[PDB]
Amino acid sequence: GIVEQCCTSICSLYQLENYCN
Amino acid sequence: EVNQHLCGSELVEALELVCGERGFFYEPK
Questions:
Q1: Which top-level group of life is the source organism from (chain B)?
Q2: Domain region containing B26
Q3: Do the Cβ atoms of B11 and A2 come within 8 Å?
Q4: Is A12 on the interface with B (CB under 8 A)?
Q5: Helix/strand/coil (H, E, C) string of A1-21?
Q6: Alpha-carbon span B29 to B3, nearest angstrom
Q7: How many domains does chain B have?
């Protein structure tokens, strides 16, 4: 998900600003 | 060194910055 795909993987703000409007 | 990552709460803070206007999917409150 977005918490498991970023809590264990150094993701960027890409998937983060995808859940936002 | 020392990468950046979020896990419970800390994550809601990152999305609170991108959006910071209405809210995103993950909404603990």
A1: Eukaryota
A2: 1-29
A3: yes
A4: no
A5: CCCHHHHCCCCCCCCCCCCCC
A6: 28
A7: 1
Experimental technique for the deposited model: NMR
**CA-based nearest distance B24→chain A, Å:** 4
Chain mean position to CA A10: 9
Checking phi first, is residue B27 left (phi over 0); if not, alpha (psi -120 to 50) or beta? beta
What are φ and ψ of residue B11, in 5° steps? -65, -50
H or E element in which residue B16 lies: helix B10-18
Which amino acid would we find at residue B15?
Answer: L
